[PDB]
RNA sequence: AACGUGUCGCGAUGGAUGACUUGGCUUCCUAUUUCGUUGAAGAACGCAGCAAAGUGCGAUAAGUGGUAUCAAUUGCAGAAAUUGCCCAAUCUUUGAAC
RNA sequence: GUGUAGCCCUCCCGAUGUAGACGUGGCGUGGGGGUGAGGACGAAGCCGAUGGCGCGAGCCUCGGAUGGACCCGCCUCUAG
RNA sequence: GGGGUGCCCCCACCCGUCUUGAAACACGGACCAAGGAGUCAAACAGACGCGCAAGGGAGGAGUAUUGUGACAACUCUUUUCUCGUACUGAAAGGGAGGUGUGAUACACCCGUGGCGUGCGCAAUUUUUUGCCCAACACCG
RNA sequence: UAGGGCUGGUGCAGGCGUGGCGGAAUUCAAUUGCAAAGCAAACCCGUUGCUGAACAUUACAACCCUUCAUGUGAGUAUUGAGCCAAAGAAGGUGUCAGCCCAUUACAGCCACGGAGCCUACGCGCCUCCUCAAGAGAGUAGCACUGUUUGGGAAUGCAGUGUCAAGCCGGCAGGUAUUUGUCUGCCAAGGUUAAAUAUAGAGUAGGAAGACCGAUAGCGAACAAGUAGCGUGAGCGAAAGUUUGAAAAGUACUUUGGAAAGAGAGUGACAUAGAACCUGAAA
């Protein structure tokens, strides 16, 4: 709203906070990102060190649907189980079956302490995740 | 004085804004609720005419 | 609710909004610091300040 | 004093941190003593990584719905600040806690990313345009 | 110019709930400006038979019976010509807000 | 749970009772109402401009 | 239907009305005796009618209608006049909504209009 | 259940009973003694209240008990005092309901007694003057 | 002394202010909706009882014909139709102009 | 009970300032949503050796041997 | 007490501006009325208000309505898209809990990796100790 | 046997269109300065009680006092009684109007309707009609030059030169070359509704607005693209007729050549007297 701006407070100050010296002129120091290596060098080097230059190979016609691969950790698996099924899963009894694809996940990682044994269906899996889920009493079923 | 800001890439260097010398290049959606009513009315009319076809 | 998807009434921040009752309850008044005696009101005949004369 | 602070200065706490702190203190209790009450001037949020807690008594400004179910399901109790002022005036047998604020994204951007020994995160608009070779990177440590 | 606004869905439902709970407190109703000195109880609940009315005279008799006619009289007297340029732009008359009657449907 | 009486439309008489809904005991946040009302009332405006 | 929510539109249509529209606009109520005899609330005013003034300076006066000045939204009644400086008497206009009709001039067309305006059952 | 503490916070800044004229905050509350917009004086908001007024040449006391506070037509009860009632009697009646208004009640009751006496004297003097007058027209309201 | 200066009452000069608004600007919708050699768009000259501009019309020239409505037009004449809509017609010299 | 016509009563310490920053239940103008009034027994506007209030922006009363139909207080929204 | 007009004694360089420095022999300045200059959009950041929270939020569309109707209401195998819960390498690719015991190892799961300084609470006695939240330093 | 109203002919129905007509209830009762005004402090009492600081035989009208004459426009205002509402809607009428006027509806009624469109592809009759090969050649491709694209050892196109294949074909598969597989398609001829635009267009109509309010808003609220300017292409204003409810727009006497002045008269007001509301500052 226009009634909260500084211009309302400055009615009668004659300079609006820009000074008698210096004044408010149009485009000193240039327009846009001009002078990135002349007279604006210190700002660019201090705050954006990796701006000027190249790095790495190129990839023409990138299709991001081919590289889709979300990940979930072993310690967040109970967020996908039924609200009841957890807390009564044991070692050698019937266990819930979790499908990662239906929930929008591709790879299973192995961070943290597993809270309940289960059977997990996944596309990819890490070596540590496979070891931990087997020790707990569960299993991993590969799916495409 | 510029401080620690992101480097801007706002992409607004063509004559898109209508002024005293430019026609401009813009699109607005003030007809959105009216067109919503029109499409529903046409669907209801078509259903009445082709009855009882789905 | 059955008409709005997964909507429930928000929980209150205070279990009892009557704050004046709490301030004047017996449980609170037990642990309040005791009152102290205050001096007499100053009379006329302004007090002296010259400690020598 | 804490009730007057702004939202950014009243950080939320997780249920897992409360349970860990309670267990560390309660294990030293002498025979015939009750666990204290956890007090936080802020919000309490659920943690899916713990799933197993004892019966805790917590007083807070606000509880998330999933947090309230987990506490009550374990046998605990959610309290309000007006209830606390009645059961325990002067704050006897209470444990005062605060949330974490050093992990925020804003804190990661404090400083300059180009000075040696900084490890600050730059304000990057275009991620592709700010990529540096492994050499020419600034020095990582300074005394 | 940005004429319209977006509001979170949960915040919109929060406001409606709060404004409904305020209508059950007779002190807040009087403070807003309504005349409810003859109303039997708050909130006011009446029988379903008011939906079968067909003549305006029956509705007026029902309003006088439940004591809601004082508020509608207050709105009637407050009608007046608007001050300023607004009367030149199809806003010639102004009036106050009276009671609101809630029905299960639009019939 | 409190009860609410139902009054007849033709005479001063109670013709039934009903239980008070839970929506009437919810918190009253006049600051939320004011914020939502201010932004909602902007949605019916028509645009104006000069040539 | 001149009246609408657009005040600018409603006033433009009224003050630019054609002659046949103006005839309907200048109508007057009927007297109680005529109302009981025809079951018609009001009729447009025509020449050679007899009217009685109910509002203004000439309150209570009666006379015959001598002119229907549609260009000026008034009617001229005999014996309702004013004296000029030199002694000439000139008619004074009266708005048709300030008078009431006492006697009607009737022809075949007028009787047909009254019949079609009658509010009766069957 | 919403207490009067919350209700006062809602109406303190904006109410139909609050009159802010020339920087002065008074109140047009019908159940307010001395018309101060301070709470503890606003009887329309407190669960219990009592106000003192006059009806003809008698003191009229209106009281609001805590019971039936959701029925507007049964909230207030009227009481007419005996002629020439001592102000201490009125003070005791109010103190039985709102003990934190006892001294205010006594002053208000004394003011009402003075007002009733002055109203009688001024009306008698005006009637005397009108008897000697002569008037051009008198209006009589038709019966029924 | 006069000239000159100042205050109050009244009067000149001037056209601000307020209240008015058949105008402008902006957005939305609905059609049996899109000109011309069967001579268009534009341009010129004329036509009324009194008629300069403007409006309408074209030597059938502030209009002829049909239809609905139902007594006016109005500054003065003059008579004893007017208004809305539209099929049938008239349509001066030019202009793509052949 | 930050902020007032400050809830009230005592006591102590500072008070100038260009460029500049910030605060104010700080003043004023056109229009929207609410609430409460005023007007032919005279609205807006205009005039003044008309006084009163506020540190101030300003607000209010009085008179008109002026005017002839609309307009304002308070809470909020908005800006050519 | 206020207001108006004189008078006496005393005091008192012309405003705005650039400038180290203006009463300046530095520039703009005859008078009055009405106009007259930090606005709108889009990306990002920080402070402050509000809702929800390991999740948050849609858009476009659709479903039901002369009614304050270009408003308001509804749209859930767990949204159909987006930001976030995980980062790292030029890339192929890979991807993070604790304690105890041994030299994709084995066994357990009420749990701060350790040390230092650390609000408050708890325990002793006319002081000392315990748990330490947030935050900071050092070593794994 | 059956069809085709889009084979043709000849007839017969309804809708779309245009114009008009039709809806309730007070000009109720009390004045012409001063009671056509009030009080009885939430609601009720109240359909009831009580009156006058503008009248001491009338207040007010300019240095003070006395005397004599002059002065209040129009009831949509106030008060008390009613009435209508499937209608409370916002325009007009000498002040603020549901009941003075015009309007406000089909939960409708009439006239005209040549062609066209829509309806068991509306419905009868007569006529007619019906039920082994190949696949686009100065083309595609290639070279040089130019331009264009995010297209990068060359995305599309143009000029000239050169110029195919089809008994193991051709084009595409985003890093150049040769060779071999796999996948998807089959250029070099043509037609085609709907969902989309109207960023200084038109013809008829509607809905409006937190917009401007006569130095503003279009240049133009008015005989405005006009008057006026320039050889010309072109440029381009100012200006609310806003007196009054109604012209009732000042007869007549007198001075004056006239213009006008002094009286008189109309109007509630003429310091509302004619480009006439209000009428500021210098
Ligand atoms: K009338
Ligand atoms: K070729
Ligand atoms: Mg500078
Ligand atoms: Mg410099
Ligand atoms: Mg469109
Ligand atoms: Mg020729
Ligand atoms: Mg200072
Ligand atoms: Mg300064
Ligand atoms: Mg404006
Ligand atoms: Mg401006
Ligand atoms: Mg110098
Ligand atoms: Mg100077
Ligand atoms: Mg000098
Ligand atoms: Mg081919
Ligand atoms: Mg084509
Ligand atoms: Mg103009
Ligand atoms: Mg004038
Ligand atoms: Na200089
Ligand atoms: Na200069
Ligand atoms: Na102009």
Swiss-Prot record, chain D:
Residues 134-143 have a biased composition (Basic residues). The keyword Lipid metabolism does not apply. Its main location: cytoplasm. GO terms for cellular component: cytoplasm; cytosolic large ribosomal subunit; nucleolus; ribosome. Residues 109-143 are annotated as: Disordered. One of its GO terms (biological process) is translation. One of its GO terms (molecular function) is RNA binding. Keywords: Cytoplasm, Ribonucleoprotein, Ribosomal protein. It comes from the Eukaryota. It is found in: Cytoplasm. Belongs to the eukaryotic ribosomal protein eL18 family. This is Large ribosomal subunit protein eL18. The gene is RPL18-A. The chain holds residues 50 to 192 of 193 of the full protein.
